[PDB]
Amino acid sequence: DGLWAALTEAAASVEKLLATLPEHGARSSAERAEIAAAHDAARALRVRFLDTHADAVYDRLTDHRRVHLRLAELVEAAATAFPGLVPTQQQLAVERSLPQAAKEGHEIDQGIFLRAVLRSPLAGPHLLDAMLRPTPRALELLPEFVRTGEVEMEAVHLERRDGVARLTMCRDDRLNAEDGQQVDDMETAVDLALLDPGVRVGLLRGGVMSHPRYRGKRVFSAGINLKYLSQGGISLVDFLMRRELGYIHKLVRGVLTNDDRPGWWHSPRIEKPWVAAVDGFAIGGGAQLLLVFDRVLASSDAYFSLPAAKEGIIPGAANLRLGRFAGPRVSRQVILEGRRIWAKEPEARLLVDEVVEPDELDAAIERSLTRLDGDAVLANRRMLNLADESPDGFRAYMAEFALMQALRLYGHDVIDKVGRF
Amino acid sequence: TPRALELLPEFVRTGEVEMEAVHLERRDGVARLTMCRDDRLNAEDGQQVDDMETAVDLALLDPGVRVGLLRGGVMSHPRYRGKRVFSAGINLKYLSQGGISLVDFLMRRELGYIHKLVRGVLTNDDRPGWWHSPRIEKPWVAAVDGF
Numbered sequence: 001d002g003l004w005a006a007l008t009e010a011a012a013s014v015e016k017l018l019a020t021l022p023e024h025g026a027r028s029s030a031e032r033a034e035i036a037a038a039h040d041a042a043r044a045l046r047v048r049f050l051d052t053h054a055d056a057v058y059d060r061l062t063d064h065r066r067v068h069l070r071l072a073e074l075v076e077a078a079a080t081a082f083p084g085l086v087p088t089q090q091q092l093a094v095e096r097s098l099p100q101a102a103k104e105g106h107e108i109d110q111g112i113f114l115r116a117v118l119r120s121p122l123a124g125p126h127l128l129d130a131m132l133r134p135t136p137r138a139l140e141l142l143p144e145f146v147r148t149g150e151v152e153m154e155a156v157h158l159e160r161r162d163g164v165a166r167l168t169m170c171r172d173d174r175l176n177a178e179d180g181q182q183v184d185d186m187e188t189a190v191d192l193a194l195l196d197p198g199v200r201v202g203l204l205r206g207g208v209m210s211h212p213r214y215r216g217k218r219v220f221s222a223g224i225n226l227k228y229l230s231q232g233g234i235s236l237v238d239f240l241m242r243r244e245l246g247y248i249h250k251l252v253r254g255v256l257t258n259d260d261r262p263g264w265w266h267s268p269r270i271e272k273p274w275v276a277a278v279d280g281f282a283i284g285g286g287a288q289l290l291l292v293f294d295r296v297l298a299s300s301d302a303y304f305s306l307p308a309a310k311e312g313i314i315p316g317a318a319n320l321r322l323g324r325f326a327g328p329r330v331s332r333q334v335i336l337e338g339r340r341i342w343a344k345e346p347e348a349r350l351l352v353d354e355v356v357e358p359d360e361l362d363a364a365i366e367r368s369l370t371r372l373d374g375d376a377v378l379a380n381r382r383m384l385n386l387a388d389e390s391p392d393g394f395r396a397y398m399a400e401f402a403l404m405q406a407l408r409l410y411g412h413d414v415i416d417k418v419g420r421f
Numbered sequence: 422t423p424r425a426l427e428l429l430p431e432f433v434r435t436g437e438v439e440m441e442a443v444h445l446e447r448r449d450g451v452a453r454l455t456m457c458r459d460d461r462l463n464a465e466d467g468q469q470v471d472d473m474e475t476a477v478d479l480a481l482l483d484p485g486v487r488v489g490l491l492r493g494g495v496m497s498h499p500r501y502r503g504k505r506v507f508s509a510g511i512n513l514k515y516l517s518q519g520g521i522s523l524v525d526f527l528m529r530r531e532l533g534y535i536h537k538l539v540r541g542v543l544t545n546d547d548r549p550g551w552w553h554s555p556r557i558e559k560p561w562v563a564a565v566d567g568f
């Protein structure tokens with residue numbers, strides 16, 4: 001051992017330098033280099049500590065894997081039980097108050113933590129299962145939703161109709177640009193759709209926009225909120241990891257329920273098929289979503305892109321999933337070089353099932369919904385998803401992503417690009 | 422057209438003519454026709470035709486022009502502000518109101534500027550080589566923005 005003590009020591013040097021040095025941007029080069037070196041020693045020890053102790057740490061927090069904790073609860077509890085391993089709620093609030101450029105990068109420590117947890121064959125699957133459980137917010141809204149067929153949330157409007165959960169993304173002023181609230185809404189809505197027994201199929205679609213350049217037109221997604229990202233308001237844990245391990249993973253695998261119904265022994269998860277309809281365009285996080293649907297429809301004029309090839313963050317699990325859809329050459333053209341793919345080009349058929357003229361689209365969406373109803377579809381989509389993406393594959397990738405993305409979230413190149421938007 | 426013969430010397434001197442529906446500029450040997458009805462997506466009427474034929478005539482007659490370029494200009498209507506648009510075709514409002522002429526619009530464009538893009542301008546016997554090339558023709562490029 002020796003590693004916990006050495007870490008505690010390196011974290012204290014960091015806190016002493018932060019307490020004594022000037023604010024970020026008033027620091028000299030010597031001072032900038034000193035604090036960077038301190039952060040580096042500490043982060044190195046977080047990695048080494050967790051390489052050997054991750055399972056024991058996770059066992060402490062979850063009572064030897066008998067309590068499912070979601071990400072936000074897990075990292076908070078880790079901070080209080082293991083001071084210096086990951087940041088406290090207080091330390092985060094100071095960070096959140098700063099613009100990205102000025103942050104110390106404490107979230108990186110959370111990336112280290114989550115990487116180590118997800119790498120573990122014991123802890124990893126368990127945390128993934130916790131994130132497939134229904135959100136409390138969704139359990140609380142479920143009876144009203146069953147009664148009313150309707151919930152209005154800040155970023156998402158959800159409506160049950162003809163056996164379909166219609167999720168409409170409705171941030172009309174900013175092209176459905178994504179943030180932490182949207183993720184919370186999306187997961188909540190996805191949870192409701194899955195738990196509601198009067199829902200047989202899901203539908204995800206962008207709502208009518210109100211910004212002058214798009215007034216009266218639907219738009220699917222313009223991807224991550226770049227303004228908020230610059231201003232410091234995009235959370236590694238509560239946005240970037242939450243969406244991947246929560247609603248998006250639930251689209252694929254369903255919601256993990258308690259043993260409280262017949263058939264649980266064969267289907268612990270309630271999964272349903274999902275249709276996405278793309279109006280205008282799907283960019284970044286929105287394009288990423290398409291890699292998880294059972295059916296994808298697009299308007300003739302639409303395009304699909306993951307644009308931040310030069311100075312962007314990793315586009316979620318597109319690096320995991322895209323290759324299976326498009327092969328390695330196209331996958332690199334899209335992600336490494338920012339190739340944008342139009343609905344009407346032949347290669348769109350790698351991502352999109354049906355491309356339809358704007359005036360034929362509503363009806364085509366309605367028909368697609370009726371084709372995905374039965375139990376044969378449920379069984380087949382489950383078997384298809386299992387073959388397409390193994391639980392190990394997903395876990396291994398999300399483990400490395402957790403840290404790789406954390407590092408990109410603080411990269412100088414990203415902070416600069418994002419500040420210019 | 423007479424209108425083109427009358428504007429030709431100023432055009433040769435200046436490299437530039439502003440018309441109601443078309444802006445014409447000589448640059449690097451290229452006649453750049455920009456269709457510039459920014460309020461209505463270059464919707465066509467009798468005046469646009471006159472301007473087009475005039476511009477096409479100038480481009481063909483001007484000896485410092487070797488190639489033509491047709492392109493839509495930047496729009497100003499709110500739904501297209503800052504975006505180029507090539508053409509939304511015939512002015513349907515005018516057509517309803519009675520202002521689309523069979524002869525001065527629908528036949529004129531086909532037999533005039535459009536046919537001149539294909540066959541060139543018929544000149545008088547007033548230059549060497551007329552016996553083999555009574556028509557001055559040049560190549561044309563079109564660039565389509567929007568639709």
Ligand SMILES: CC(C)(COP(=O)(O)OP(=O)(O)OC[C@H]1O[C@@H](n2cnc3c(N)ncnc32)[C@H](O)[C@@H]1OP(=O)(O)O)[C@@H](O)C(=O)NCCC(=O)NCCNC(=O)Cc1cc(O)cc(O)c1
Nearest residue numbers: 174175177211213222223224225226227284285314315316
């Ligand atoms: C969509 C566009 C091409 C349209 O161009 P225009 O028609 O000229 O529109 P604009 O006027 O710029 O946008 C209209 C309107 O939406 C706003 N808008 C559009 N997209 C955004 C984003 N992404 N953020 C913030 N605001 C936005 C824009 O600022 C305008 O509002 P005001 O500033 O208040 O006027 C353009 O707006 C654009 O470039 N948007 C940004 C596209 C982009 O780079 N998105 C981010 C890609 N990167 C990710 O998703 C990263 C990501 C997401 C994830 O979910 C996970 C992950 O691991 C990584």
Ligand SMILES: CC(C)(COP(=O)(O)OP(=O)(O)OC[C@H]1O[C@@H](n2cnc3c(N)ncnc32)[C@H](O)[C@@H]1OP(=O)(O)O)[C@@H](O)C(=O)NCCC(=O)NCCNC(=O)Cc1cc(O)cc(O)c1
Nearest residue numbers: 460461462464465498500509510511512513514515527530
């Ligand atoms: C082009 C559009 C799809 C753009 O649509 P939106 O994105 O809905 O934008 P809009 O707001 O409609 O257009 C902006 C602006 O341009 C005006 N606009 C656009 N296209 C036109 C046309 N063709 N005419 C008149 N005004 C037009 C429109 O009315 C708006 O201004 P306001 O009326 O002040 O609101 C739409 O406007 C439209 O439907 N245009 C008409 C398309 C059409 O059928 N055109 C005529 C087709 N038929 C021919 O050209 C026939 C023809 C032509 C010839 O030259 C020779 C011949 O032998 C036969």
